[PDB]
């Protein structure tokens, strides 16, 4: 048996920093004499000299203990609010997978209109780890784009919302665009490589052979994309709710709008395996919220 | 072998179901696409379609072609943009509050022609990238691995984090702290931004709260916070404007207030001067940032 | 369109490590000027100008072409096999995931005595991550030990075998054993502290106070521990199946007999979801081979 | 606080089910095992049993504290047996064959007191972790990228990959490579020994096979193959044994022989003397391992 307390391990951490007995013993606003028989315990609790008493450091069983100290009281207190924050509510909380490009969008349009009965804890992920979490439950559910791999019999799915790709970009200050999409070797502002939208983008870029660009810039945050290409550094295709409200007032300006648009078709995925109740009324529930989106 | 017109063949000849349909959207005649199929099966070795059976439907062998197919298609119909996008990138990796502060004043003070590749990766795996490659500069916070040897660390700035929630109309912030079991919107355990408050959300025990919206993206729970989801901790640089017009209340400014000092990391190994030159240049932003 | 042909990709990396025409044409066994009509449609099919034909290496632009060709190449090839080995078979393989102390020791055993109308694909974890990957879907089965949290209401299990614990060490070259557990400080060879039999040693050590020791060794690999155990450098806790033949020939003697003896037992688990009808079958299988282990 | 006999007192709770019986077999009287316990709920401020409602069952708040009171006492409980064994432990991740066979060796050549810290890890995560820390040196085979800047490298020795299979009886091999859709025993995509036999089996269309056995474990695949489950790729060293009595018959040693070169690495960055000692020491195993 053992009877190591958590006051020993506070005052152990707070004698590592300043090495001194007297000097850290009123950082924890005890007498001296009481904090000398506290790390006298914990010295003999663990059953190992932990200082070195006459030099101030401990020897290297110390300095083994100190990792395992500060990771233990890291995890007590991250596992402490475990249970104290969300106690039973939140132990049945709403998996959800977003991929980059849409996940800051409609998350809080999705969890702002929906019951207050509920737990969310949101991954941020890519499209192409979308098919594996589901099979692979690491996300009870998920909201990314169209995929008919994972859109076929082996998955449920419900379509919230559609949108079209606009090719945008700042205006030179008279209402007209800082750019054409004819000038040769244009700054081109790109998703990432791996995003749903860099598929896109690349594949109406290479149909159309009149357009020379040049990579000028790539983020797979919608926002960054946004925020790059409105403060005038080059072209980019960016999704309409994002640039609906800096096109009403003419911030930025659509390029294009026949051949060179992209639509974006956004789908809630889940597998026809009848889930947990919680689960299965927000899938009910996200039926209902289809037709605000 | 394989040529990619062989996939494309193959790829279109279940967008549209026919083998003299496929050959008439692929502008070739029945002979030639029997020959342009058949000789991507020879190469692979393996028979993807049970031959004039039925309305053709590919047997298992095929499945696991045409789900790759595309992968394989994707991968090079959008490294070919790539080629022909061009000079020297620069591999950012940060989070995502510090890529929207940051690095929109950091493209227009730095010189006139570095292409940034930001990645905006949350700083849990944007550090893992750091250490093990792939990614050149990153901008993430404290990391005491990352202070030390075979690492440089750049002193960019400090802020606050601040127990903040939107409030209703004209007035005053809908939840408090004093509250019963208010609604928390809290990072995980795993981030560095989660650590940070679950260490401190224990050392008060007058806070009873139950958990509700868990991420791990910083701008997430700004966002979510910002419509009056719950209470949350959150980097005054990123919601400052969200102060000043009210949008955010600040509940406590006083014992709940965490200090975070978000740092710039590179390898220590200088194999790139363009990189070098961004290096010593990200140096000059940090007097006046 | 495109018109990429693999034999130009192969020709562009040899190419690459000769940088010379006719010094390269030679490897690919063609000769000089249609080798060069291949790197010349190359050059054109992506539209960007690989090499640099006059000092010889490519610009940077082919540079970025030369790790994308390689890790296309190599996920051409690593798929290629995918449908080639495998056929419709191993599309459906058993997922087993396999604790590092016995995965070594069960599956052979296991895999023998199963009908060969199956295919494996088999994970090494920790006992940890054990209770995750089962509700995860990572891993359809699972061969771990003992654990009240995954043998509750949410799992259906099979106990296979079991085993115990001996502390074993080497002969001096009589008979006798080369170590004694009484005396101080003695080489002692743990299991890693991630490791199932990790936690019963330090319970089991820690309930005698007459046992002091010193840790000069720690290895997750049980095969790993018992060599260095039999082969003269301290003491461990191994189990009966990896030192049962070592004992009957008087390679490894066996220390104790009583309070110092941990029992292990083994289950495979899975969760109470019928889950598909190949896994199923196995489940029924696995069930038959339990009274030959 | 929080004091560990509390947790034991709670843990117990649950191991046999019953107050004044936990503290009949925790060796206290009911009027100090109840205070024990009201000050382990009040110190973590949430109660997990319905108190006397019921033969006891701890509510919602208990499942998740019990399941890991576990966690957290499994954790101090083994270290505190770490804390009372020692020198400088020596943090070793390296792959399966490489710890059996360099290791042992190593060991007894290696001066008198190094108390190694083996971690035999797989190594698609064993050059994981030493690119990224909580590793001194690892035992891995060839990464161009750990041969360069900040990654030493020894040359250990050279080896060659075998298609072998168990023979039955008094005789030749079950499987031949001749044979139609042979079972397979590979290796995969992930690690370093499957993308090297992936693209050897790709150039050789002669070989029909069936994938059987996947795995990333390179000794899985010796013991499994070792019984005539299917034909597999061994490297030499670790499978010498059963070449020369006859349990594993080499089926081709001529094209599909593949080159293997095993190294070891550090991080370049010398800040223990013990490592050093060790690291310096290792380059004299290398003229004659």
């Given at each position: 048996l053992h009877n190591i307390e958590t006051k020993w391990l506070y005052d152990f951490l707070t004698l590592e920093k300043c090495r001194n007995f007297s000097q850290a013993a009123i950082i924890r606003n005890v007498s001296q004499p009481a904090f000398s028989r506290r790390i006298r315990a914990l010295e003999h609790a663990v059953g190992v000299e932990l200082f070195n008493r006459q030099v101030l450091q401990l020897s290297e069983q110390g300095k083994i203990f100190h990792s395992q100290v500060r990771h233990l009281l890291q995890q007590l207190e991250s596992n402490l609010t475990e249970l104290r924050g969300g106690?039973?509510?939140?132990?049945?909380?709403?998996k959800i997978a977003a991929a980059h490009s849409l996940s800051l969008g409609l998350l809080p349009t999705i969890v702002k209109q929906m019951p207050t009965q509920f737990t969310y804890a949101v991954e941020a992920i890519d499209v192409d780890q979308a098919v594996d979490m589901l099979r692979e439950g690491q996300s009870d559910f998920i909201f990314s784009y169209h995929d008919e791999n994972l859109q076929q019999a082996p998955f449920d799915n419900i379509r919230l919302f559609e949108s079209r790709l606009f090719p945008v970009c700042a205006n030179n200050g008279r209402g007209e665009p800082r750019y054409t999409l004819e000038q040769p070797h244009f700054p081109l502002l790109n998703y990432s490589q791996n995003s749903y939208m860099g598929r896109l983008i690349n594949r109406t870029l290479t149909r159309h052979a009149e357009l020379s660009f040049s990579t000028f810039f790539v983020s797979s945050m919608s926002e960054l994309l946004k925020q790059v290409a409105m403060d005038g550094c080059g072209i980019a295709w960016l999704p309409e709710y994002a640039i609906r409200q800096e096109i009403t007032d003419g911030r930025l300006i659509v390029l294009d709008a026949d051949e060179l648009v992209i639509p974006i078709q956004a789908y809630a995925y889940r597998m026809n395996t009848r889930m947990s109740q919680v689960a299965e009324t927000f899938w009910r529930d996200l039926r209902g919220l289809q037709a605000a989106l």
């Open positions: 106690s039973d509510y939140t132990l049945r909380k709403i």
